[PDB]
RNA sequence: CCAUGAUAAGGAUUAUAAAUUGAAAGUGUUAAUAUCAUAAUCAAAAUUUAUUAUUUAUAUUAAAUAUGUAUGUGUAGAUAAAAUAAGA
């Protein structure tokens, strides 16, 4: 078969600091140029609503660092789990040429953003109460809804 | 005898009351949109004609859709072209009728589609059909295969001619007796890849295996929710309830009506003595293939979720090596692919969700890409198909020019009975041979041993094994099976491509432990794997410790070594068709079991003899 | 015992049909 | 829970040997017996001794000594593997090695006319029936 | 210290014979010959360990390069979990 | 017989490695014996098993002798070779019990179990009022009234 | 096995000198074997 | 040259005149032996 | 691992049986004793040097025994190449199945050398009659075995080549370091 | 809302030979869980709610209301158990 490139992952956290992004924005275009499909993703951010600036400042710089590199890549759809906020940006390789650099806009960030909050509030709020053992389990649940600590 | 009373039933000038479509009862539901399905295609979730016909109703208002399906008479029953070898043999007619069966259910139970099942000439029941049901637009997928295109294109100027068919002689007649102008559209959807985007035009594309693999690197696949879509929405279109079966029906306490069809069986389809096609082995795999649409898919998730990946390739390796034959983990998807029961559109969407899901691993992109390879050499197989036409059918292959070492075919028909029985001595071939028989599939490696043993290893014909293969594996495809009977037999000899591999090199290098071949002859259990693959070699006493007597039980091999004419008699050289043999005391009547003019020999409707067909039965009659 | 193994092993080779009662006999008295 | 079509290992074969190899259980019981007493005595008041002469040629054939397996010779056994207990793959593994040892090629079972078995008599002639043929 | 060849052998005509002057496409083995008499030891013990006298008749059910696979295995897992 | 619904099969190994419970019951191997005397034939092949299974439970209590003092290279060999010399007498003492029975089946017009074969009258195995409305093994639909493999009088 | 041991018993309480063939053949020796107790775990 | 007297006809350190599997036991002791 | 019939008495394990016939056949011992010395009673009464010399019709055949691999050609005394080298990667036994480990072991070497031989002796005898050298009816071929590598292969490499010693002989049995 | 106890899993080895019918089962810890001595806002009658070891083909509902849906050649992967009046 043809050699499929390695589909890398860079991680993130919320509070790396500025030198610490910046080094591995460089090192995401770097292995843009490769041609590696590159995954970032924020492991450790507490809240989905404080989790969201520094991934889109994040995204400035990895935008930044593919210009002065020639690394033209289309970022994806930002995806946020629970407990991480991921997307995909794919270089040009292959059946898809990309010859710019794309990054969505604050607009979809913002509407991604209170989507990813809805998504989390409304599942914290009423899952939880159902997704687990009655007896023990939904009653500790119910403890920590009224301490507020349920999040 | 069923044929002709087929015939007699339905291609009649007079079309009796008992065997008509009834009419609908709303003036609306007069005119409906018919679809064709074949074997290419028993599928309702990505077939791009159904697709489009529902499309084509929806666009035309509350037009009914309405579903046809007419075997192929000819293809269960009738002889092959040489050696007189059965063409669907009863194991893949039983597949092919139970795929029909789960296809008409699917339609009437779950999309409320009315199936019509006809039995005879594909080319007179669709057009007449096509007439009585007043249908406007008939939607089919393009067959491009010989006794396949031709009848697909006689269909089609049938539809569009307008023209009715009698069958007491081969008669047409025009539409002006029916006791609109009706279009044929013909979609193309067997390859991956559909045609119109392939990289490089067919007439230009360069003969390469590794050409059209770095082709469909850049090439794109259609998805399928467009499809699924149209799909989804024929339901909201008004369906004709008369044309569904009842309780009574499903249940099976009384047959279908005469105008709907009757699913035919074994004896009217034309196969006689069934207890001579009863292989009485020891069945080593512990897979089976449930036919079907859903039963497909469960598979594929199943094979996905079971870590059967790494049947492409080992973890971590980045290079192909020895498969196993024995495993359990590979993907038996041949059959559900080649009957059109799956679609590789559909498979390939879900190796990429699960290459996807699971792209956290640093390996799994690899595999996905050997499983596309594999696909798109499929398609490759395709394409050279439709390129050579019907010269790939022809002696000494369709490339001539590179047969310069090849012999004249000498053809022996005890040679071939003992080939296509597995009475060999090599111990890899027979076990390939016992799975392709008795499952009705067999792995690649398997198929490139059989095919090259047959073709240079014995010196026989290379269509007497191709079409032997045909009659067995369930996952016949006509252009990629003879594609490698031919490029395996190095009558196609394209250069940058797999080399033709020895039997004993593929012995050597998929099975050197022997794992398959004591699990599918576990009577050699006992010899070490430095005997193994050449059992002949043991002496006296080391034959009587491993329990392994050559003549009694694994006779000798069909090539014997230099000399072996006087160090050998009769006694050690044991006969298997003989007329004292057990190959004779079979049938119930007694004519022989499986292998050479088997048709000639079992089968109840015999259409044109050959006259080589004729000098092999008296040949076989006087030996 | 080197003769009677070597006695012992050259029955074993030699006659597979029969084995040497006296040779197996003779070695565990010598050994 | 899932449904298969996969012919199981107990198919049984009709054509090899005239029991069915890996047969069926059955279960002869005391009536069975005075059932064929009866039989059997009807049979030899009436005169007709095929039947016992088929009997008999049947015991010739399979009731013979087997023969002594030279060292070495032994059943194939099952590996011991790390993979808890394959309880299942042992179990298939010796009902294919008993369905392929089917009763026609036992080795070790002299059967045939080449053999000669100092035992029973050859023919049907030789027994008490042709007192009167074998006189003087 | 042909026809003449099939009439003189009706046995070989369901099988093939090997040309001994040149090597055919599918080679085929000859049976080897092993020593009747041994002249002292170490001989016989050698052809009983050749004949497969002292092999275990456990079948192989997974093959030797299977431990080679798992160890490569948790070699790459290893590395990418560092 | 009285035994009509339907059987499973098992290897030889796994009846004959069941001892004086079911292959060497007296009470059955007395039967046995009563079959083959009663159809006038020796019973050597059943007499060879009965002093097999006799010598084999008298000295099951008794513990093996050291392994250690025996020859692995000559002791084992000849012990296995023994044990597969007794298994093989006992497969066929149990073939010929089976074989035996199909022919006194045949014989006195006794209808066997399901998917049981008997040579000269059924030679496919006879099935009758079976779960499955189709043959196992041959998917051959079965009639309401069976089939009649004997003649109706007596 | 339980008749043979009274049986046995029986002969060496009537013939003193039965004692001794019996006793060597192991007719008066006792086997506590005894078969499990109910549980319900198994 | 691989023929007659060859390259490695002078540099063979062992030769034995003729079974030669004892012969090879027997070699590759004594090479066990040295090394 | 506990003992199974702990719970049964020796004397039980096994029981002894038939005492009553050991008063007899010592009876009968003494008997037949007393008879026999009655019997013995009355009979009484009554370059050059160790260096071998090759021929011309013999051929050298070179084994290779590697680490991983293990290789079998021949030669002719002119100096020709009869058949190409055979190796465990040609044969297709390197490619799995059985691990690296086992690549160059004893059996793999002796059915490699096996595969070359059969294969070597119809182009042999094809190459003997190029020149009007007839093999003859009885095929005894001389070899000279030259034996390189110190591994488990080479033991399989000799046994083969000791094999089907009736078509070849050996003549010399050389090592090389 | 009491966090503290039990339990699960679960192993150890001397009995020569004669006599005798005799002279023969033992648990830490790691774990999970919980109803007890210890820290206030809420489970036990109105139960759907999914909780491992089940009756397969000659005859099948009468005493507290006591089961109408899985025939398909008995065909996967994993999991558990024993040398104990039985007969490796
Ligand atoms: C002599 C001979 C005859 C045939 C074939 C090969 C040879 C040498 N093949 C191709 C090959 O044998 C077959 O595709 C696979 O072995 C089927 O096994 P799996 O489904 O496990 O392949 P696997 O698990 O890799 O399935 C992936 C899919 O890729 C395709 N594929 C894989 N290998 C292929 C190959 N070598 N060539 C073409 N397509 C391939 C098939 O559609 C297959 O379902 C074939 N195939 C077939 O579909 N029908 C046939 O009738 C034959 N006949």
Known sequence: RPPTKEGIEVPFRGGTHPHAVRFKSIGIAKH??????????????????????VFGSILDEVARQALQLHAYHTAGVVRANYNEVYCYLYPSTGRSPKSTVLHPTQEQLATVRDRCLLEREREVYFDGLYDKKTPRERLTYMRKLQDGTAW | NYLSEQDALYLSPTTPEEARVPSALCPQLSACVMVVFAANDMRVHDNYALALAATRAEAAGGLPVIAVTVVDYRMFAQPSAVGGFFRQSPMRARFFLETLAALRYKLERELRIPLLVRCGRPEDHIPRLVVECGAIDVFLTTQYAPHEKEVHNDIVEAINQRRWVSRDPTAGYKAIEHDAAPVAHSVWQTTLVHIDDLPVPVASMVE????YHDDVTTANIRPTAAFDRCINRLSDLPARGDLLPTTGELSGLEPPPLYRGRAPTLVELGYGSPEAFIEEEVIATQSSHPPGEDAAIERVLDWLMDGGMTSMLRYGRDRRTNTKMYSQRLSRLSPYLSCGALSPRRFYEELRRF?????????????????????????????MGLRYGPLLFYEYGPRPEHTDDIADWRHDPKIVQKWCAGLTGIPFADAAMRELTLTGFVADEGRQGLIWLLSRGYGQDWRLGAEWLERCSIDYDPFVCYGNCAYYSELVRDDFGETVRNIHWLAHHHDQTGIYVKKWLPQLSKIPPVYIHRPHVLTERMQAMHGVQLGKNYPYPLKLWDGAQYTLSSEHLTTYFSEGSQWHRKAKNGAGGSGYAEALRHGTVILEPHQLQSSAFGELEHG | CQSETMALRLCMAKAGKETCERESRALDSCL | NKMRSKPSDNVAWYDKGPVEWLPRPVRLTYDHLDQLQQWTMRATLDGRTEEFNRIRDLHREWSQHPLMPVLGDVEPKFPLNLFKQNHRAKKRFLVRW??????????????????????????????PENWKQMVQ | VRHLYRQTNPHMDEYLASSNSRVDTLPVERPLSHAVTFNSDAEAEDQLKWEGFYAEPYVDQAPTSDIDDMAHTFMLTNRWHR | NTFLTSSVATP??????????WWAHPERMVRQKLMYFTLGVDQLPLRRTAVIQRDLQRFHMCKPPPRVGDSTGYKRSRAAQLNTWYRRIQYQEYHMQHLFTRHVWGLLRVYPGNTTKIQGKADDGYVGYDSVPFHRYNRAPLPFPARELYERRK | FALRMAVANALVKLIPLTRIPLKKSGLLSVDRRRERGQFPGY | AHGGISHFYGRTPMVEEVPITLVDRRIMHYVHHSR | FPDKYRRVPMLLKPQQGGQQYFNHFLIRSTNDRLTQQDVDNASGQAMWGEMPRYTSDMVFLYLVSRRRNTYAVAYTYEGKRILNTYTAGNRGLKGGDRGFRSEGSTDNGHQVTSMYLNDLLPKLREMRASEGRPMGRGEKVELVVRVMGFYNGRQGAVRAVQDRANEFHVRYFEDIT
């Open chain 2, 355 to 383: 290459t996807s899901e699971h792209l956290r691993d640093n390996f799994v992109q690899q595999q996905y890409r050997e499983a596309l390879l594999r696909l798109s050499r499929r398609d490759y197989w395709h394409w």
């Open chain 4, 98 to 127: 008993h369905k392929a040892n089917t009763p026609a090629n036992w080795l070790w079972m002299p059967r045939g006319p080449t053999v000669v078995t100092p035992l029973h008599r050859t023919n049907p002639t030789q027994y």
């Open chain 1, 32 to 53: 843009l140029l490769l041609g590696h499909v590159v995954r970032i993703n924020l492991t450790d951010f507490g809240t989905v609503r404080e989790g969201f600036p």
């Open chain 6, 12 to 21: 030889p190994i796994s009846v004959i490695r069941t001892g004086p419970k």
């Open chain 2, 208 to 211: 390469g295996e590794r050409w």
